[PDB]
RNA sequence: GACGGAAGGGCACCACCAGGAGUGGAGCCUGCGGCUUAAUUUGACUCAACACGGGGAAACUCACCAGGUCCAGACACAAUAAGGAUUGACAGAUUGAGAGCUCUUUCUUGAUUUUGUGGGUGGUGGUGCAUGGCCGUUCUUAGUUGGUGGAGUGAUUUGUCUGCUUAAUUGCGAUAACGAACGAGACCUUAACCUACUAAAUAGGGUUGCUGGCACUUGCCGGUUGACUCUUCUUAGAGGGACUAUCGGUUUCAAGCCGAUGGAAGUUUGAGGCAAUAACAGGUCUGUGAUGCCCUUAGACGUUCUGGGCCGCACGCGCGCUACACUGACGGAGCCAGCGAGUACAACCUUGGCCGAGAGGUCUGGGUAAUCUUGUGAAACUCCGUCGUGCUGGGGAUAGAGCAUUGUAAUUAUUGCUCUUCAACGAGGAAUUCCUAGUAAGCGCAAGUCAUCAGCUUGCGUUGAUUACGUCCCUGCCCUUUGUACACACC
């Protein structure tokens, strides 16, 4: 049932909007970047956000997505 | 209420010395701490004192708490004969 | 003229772990500045104190139960030292919440 | 003042009094707390007790 | 003196609780909120917070000394081993207990209940809390028991942002017609909270990007 | 809105599939009845009462009953004002009685009072529909507002939805809505991974002293706090770590789901903790010096002693435990956890050694505790022999007898072990409970209780599978659409 929540998705979207460069596809670097730029009071949440950003990046290689 | 008066006097003296009295909510107890009197008697005495003003009471947590007002202090003085500039806890003993 | 090694245990017990840790760190720093042989901030099985209770005041509902737990943190700080130095250290080295206790002698 | 006003109350639920209400009902003697559980379940947070798991 | 460490700690906790209760009872007029016990060798410091600190103090060593004596009597310790200090609380608005006490006082003297609640809420908002909530349960005209919820801003009900974030205060208010119960939950603002996390655990905020100009000829800049 | 014996969607092992393990059967132990009683005190009654009130009650408990005792009638006002207000009082009568309870005698006792009138306090007395508080339940379901916009004269509504997913109002998309909040999530504690960090004569492991036992050669196996260093395991601290990652197709190649690879860990990583909106006339006034009112009040519902009783049985129901065998049984023999908790002002956890067939005692301890009880050397389990499908050595039930132990007090066996008696019960009818992984079930231990008791609860390990991995057929809820003459809402 691993549907990413509204909040995570929103955060990912925001990240993509503001920092479309510096999101180097793979997870690990991206995670670190997320931790740096976005302020998350958690770790797991940050990781989730990173994952979603990576997914978005992967998508955006194979076309344009809505929003 | 039928207090052997010596005991009562002792209790009063103790109160005056302290400025403060802490009583257990323990009736059936043979003897109170500090004073060689029954807890019950002490409690009764303090109740009596309260009923005519004098003492402020708390029932908190199986413990009765007793602080003496100015009128109460005066009454105690009258009882004991001690004149002026005396103990309770209205002022510090020196530097403490 | 003195300097007679006693070997001194310091107890550090409390609940609020962060504070305890800070205290421990401070103690170790102080030891370093007075330069002594010392065993570290040895940690013991952090004792939980469990009290499990019916949540209901009166036993009329579903059988809800709550485990009210108390985390405890027991720390030994061993010093190869005389007593005077320990005394000097324990002039300060007290922070609110945490229990500072000196066992003294080996 | 009467001579016989006490039973041999060394133990049992009689001697065991609570620290708040003095109840003989559901007394957590454990850890030397001596509280009737209901009251504890209200004060516990100040007694340092918390629930996590 | 000296028991099992766990046991000792438990006893200390119990003592603290007892003390708190006593202060709630004894210092009711004094506008008391919290106790801050500091146990060191010899001198045990007991900090006490209230709205009306002057009352607590008395006229230099009045009530406080009496309280000290009482404490000594309770727990066997001697004169000097227990010290008591009374302090001003840094803005009472964030403090739930104080607010509850104030509400109780307002009720007991004779005032409009709803209006009082609203006033309290306003005060809290002015102080600078993110939100707050008052609940007044009992008879508020007519026999049937009525709840009365009054709120401002967000109120987080679930999660560990409660034990870290929301000061809660429950009180019984005694009346001639029947006993009222006043619950008050206060949403302290994340930033001013200091202890624990400085923001709400779900929230994610990202900073503004900074602009960089590319090309402009490679060039060499030497020292 | 609620409701329908309407229509569809959509959940949910408190629903059913496919399964298991069963309960109801049998014996008991324990609630609840119903009676009965001196009193068998009571609070509950579909899920949301019925091993529950932390309720395993020998007195205490204690709320019940039969009796005795006491004032703990505060203060305010009067008659006594010492030529006396007054508490006591062994002996024996009196008297359950080394209770002067009261009467006898005749010494004390020292204006505290005696006893009335105003008045209060106490109450496990009542009212939970007068309440607070807490709890339970709708529901741990996925709900619930609000700001600006639209539709409305309005109440309202849209947002919050045709659809597809999700554990989820979880999201994607469609779209007079857009962006928001609470709730779900996130968070938090724990359980898992770290041969990388932080350290440990309170956790451990190494090399050599001293020697113990060997094979007899160098080498094994040890014990011993000797010395030394490490930190894998143990412990926590600090961090990190999994984000459905990596491809494979599916589905508008959306949201997502399934399969393989890697990986400690791919069921929200497992388990909770917390938990919205409104409520229910749900539960308690027997947790309260939390309590409005009414009641009662000193030949008391205040108290306290003495004894019983809440444990009665013609019989209803519900929790459980033990059995119905060869997956055994009994001996041996092997031998393994994890949570725990445990005293100095006391009567703790208690090793180790002599005496007792047990049960146990005693002298010495060690532990206000990773250090001692303790490697809690637990059970289940694993080997050999004996008896082999008989109400039998399965089963240990109704029962007599001693010795102990607890506690002043054990009869109505408190409990304990020993010899005995050795019954009902040959896999449980109708109904239905619980469950989807270290989960079910088995098997113990510990804590809670606790002077004493476990068959109970909380916990923790220890063995450890079957079958789904779905669907609305039944049950319950949920939302939509519908109708309604109900809104104290179909009781
Ligand atoms: Mg939230
Ligand atoms: Mg949550
Ligand atoms: Mg239900
Ligand atoms: Mg019994
Ligand atoms: Mg009462
Ligand atoms: Mg009700
Ligand atoms: Mg509008
Ligand atoms: Mg709507
Ligand atoms: Mg697929
Ligand atoms: Mg979870
Ligand atoms: Mg009702
Ligand atoms: Mg009452
Ligand atoms: Mg009963
Ligand atoms: Mg049950
Ligand atoms: Mg051990
Ligand atoms: Mg036979
Ligand atoms: Mg039980
Ligand atoms: Mg019609």
UniProtKB/TrEMBL annotation, chain A:
It comes from Kluyveromyces lactis (strain ATCC 8585 / CBS 2359 / DSM 70799 / NBRC 1267 / NRRL Y-1140 / WM37). This is KLLA0B01474p. Belongs to the eukaryotic ribosomal protein eS17 family.
TrEMBL record, chain B:
It comes from Kluyveromyces lactis (strain ATCC 8585 / CBS 2359 / DSM 70799 / NBRC 1267 / NRRL Y-1140 / WM37). Belongs to the eukaryotic ribosomal protein eS10 family. GO terms for cellular component: cytosolic small ribosomal subunit. Component of the ribosome, a large ribonucleoprotein complex responsible for the synthesis of proteins in the cell. The small ribosomal subunit (SSU) binds messenger RNAs (mRNAs) and translates the encoded message by selecting cognate aminoacyl-transfer RNA (tRNA) molecules. The large subunit (LSU) contains the ribosomal catalytic site termed the peptidyl transferase center (PTC), which catalyzes the formation of peptide bonds, thereby polymerizing the amino acids delivered by tRNAs into a polypeptide chain. Signal peptide: none annotated. Keywords: Cytoplasm, Ribonucleoprotein, Ribosomal protein. It is found in: Cytoplasm. This is KLLA0B08173p. GO terms for molecular function: RNA binding; structural constituent of ribosome. Its main location: cytoplasm. InterPro entries: Plectin_eS10_N, Ribosomal_eS10, WH-like_DNA-bd_sf, WH_DNA-bd_sf. The keyword Repressor does not apply. Gene3D superfamilies: Winged helix-like DNA-binding domain superfamily/Winged helix DNA-binding domain (1.10.10.10). Transmembrane segments: none annotated. GO terms for biological process: cellular response to amino acid starvation; ribosomal subunit export from nucleus. Residues 3-92 form the Plectin/eS10 N-terminal domain.
TrEMBL record, chain C:
GO terms for molecular function: structural constituent of ribosome. InterPro entries: Ribosomal_uS10 (IPR001848), Ribosomal_uS10_dom (IPR027486), Ribosomal_uS10_dom_sf (IPR036838), Ribosomal_uS10_euk/arc (IPR005729). GO terms for cellular component: small ribosomal subunit. Residues 9-103 form the Small ribosomal subunit protein uS10 domain. GO terms for biological process: translation. Keywords: Ribonucleoprotein, Ribosomal protein. Belongs to the universal ribosomal protein uS10 family. PANTHER family: 30S RIBOSOMAL PROTEIN S10 FAMILY MEMBER (PTHR11700). This is Small ribosomal subunit protein uS10. It comes from Kluyveromyces lactis (strain ATCC 8585 / CBS 2359 / DSM 70799 / NBRC 1267 / NRRL Y-1140 / WM37) (Yeast).
UniProtKB/TrEMBL annotation, chain E:
InterPro entries: KH_dom-like_a/b, KH_dom_type_2, KH_sf_prok-type, Ribosomal_S3_C_sf, Ribosomal_uS3, Ribosomal_uS3_C, Ribosomal_uS3_CS, Ribosomal_uS3_euk/arc. Residues 19-90 form the KH type-2 domain. SUPFAM superfamilies: Prokaryotic type KH domain (KH-domain type II), Ribosomal protein S3 C-terminal domain. The keyword Aminoacyl-tRNA synthetase does not apply. One of its GO terms (molecular function) is structural constituent of ribosome. It comes from the Eukaryota. Keywords: Ribonucleoprotein, Ribosomal protein, RNA-binding. GO terms for cellular component: cytosolic small ribosomal subunit; nucleus. Residues 211-223 have a biased composition (Basic and acidic residues). The keyword Nucleotide-binding does not apply. GO terms for biological process: translation. NCBIfam families: PRK04191.1 (NF003219), uS3_euk_arch (TIGR01008). Belongs to the universal ribosomal protein uS3 family. This is Small ribosomal subunit protein uS3.
